[PDB]
Amino acid sequence: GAMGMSYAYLFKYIIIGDTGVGKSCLLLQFTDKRFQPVHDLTIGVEFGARMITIDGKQIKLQIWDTAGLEAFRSITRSYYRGAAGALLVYDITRRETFNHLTTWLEDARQHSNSNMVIMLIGNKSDLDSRREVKKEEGEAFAREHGLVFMETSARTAANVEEAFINTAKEIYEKIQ
Ligand SMILES: Nc1nc2c(ncn2[C@@H]2O[C@H](COP(=O)(O)OP(=O)(O)NP(=O)(O)O)[C@@H](O)[C@H]2O)c(=O)[nH]1
Ligand SMILES: [Mg+2]
């Protein structure tokens, strides 16, 4: 397809974060409204895509789902380039995935535009009894670094639509 032919804008997203935080399940819940209970480790980039409506216009999201597993991750961070948005994801039940955010963020901004809209996502909000990271901590990291923030559950679909749609609304407001 092409912008000005089969859609008004194409917004490229990348989804980054530690292994098991729920990147792939967020994507699948977004496009297919299905929850995948098994952890299938992503290795190369996997592409997802969906049409959305923003301000009455047809926008296509091209979504690059990436490997969290360090053993599978390339040292060449070339797949950042061209992304209008990034979904930066951690597991609210696993403190270490939150501690790695600084490095993911640095990685993201060193190989992408300062332009890029970054949505910080605390996923697995359905597992409240196992919470290790306060909602306030994710809120504060976002503010401190000029990100938007949302907690989601790929399992129950809570805020999943909003995570992807609000990212696009942010991009839209930025560029027009
Ligand atoms: N309870 C619950 N489990 C979730 C949620 N999101 C993902 N999971 C589970 O967590 C595991 C990891 O999901 P996955 O999306 O594969 O994570 P990933 O970030 O893509 N991992 P990788 O980087 O290795 O590809 C799966 O077993 C999945 O079912 C959620 O919101 N709630
Ligand atoms: Mg994955």
SSE layout:
Blueprint: E1 9-17, H1 23-32, E2 46-54, E3 57-65, E4 85-91, H2 95-99, H3 101-110, E5 117-123, H4 135-145, E6 148-152, H5 160-175
Parallel strand pairs: 1-3, 1-4, 4-5, 5-6
Antiparallel strand pairs: 2-3
Phosphoaminophosphonic acid-guanylate ester is lined by residues 17, 19-25, 36-42, 67-69, 123-124, 126-127, 153-155.
Organism: Drosophila melanogaster (Fruit fly)
GO molecular function: GTP binding; GTPase activity; magnesium ion binding
Main location: other
Structural descriptors:
6 strands, globular, Rossmann fold, binds phosphoaminophosphonic acid-guanylate ester, 30% helix, monomeric, hydrolase, alpha/beta, monomer, GTP hydrolysis, GH01619p, 176 residues, binds magnesium ion
Provide a count of the helices.
5
CATH H-level superfamily: P-loop containing nucleotide triphosphate hydrolases
Ligands bound, unique: phosphoaminophosphonic acid-guanylate ester, magnesium ion
Distance between the termini: 22 Å
Describe the structure.
GO terms for molecular function: GTP binding; GTPase activity; magnesium ion binding. This protein is α/β, with parallel strands linked by helices and 176 residues long. It has one domain: P-loop containing nucleotide triphosphate hydrolases (Rossmann fold). It is built from 5 helices and 6 strands. The protein has helices at residues 23-32, 95-99, 101-110, 135-145, 160-175; strands spanning 9-17, 46-54, 57-65, 85-91, 117-123, 148-152. It has a 6-stranded mixed β-sheet with strand order 2-3-1-4-5-6, sandwiched between helices. A hairpin with a 2-residue loop joins β2 (46-54) and β3. The longest helix has 16 residues, at 160-175. The site of magnesium ion has 4 residues, from α1. The site of phosphoaminophosphonic acid-guanylate ester has 25 residues, from α1.
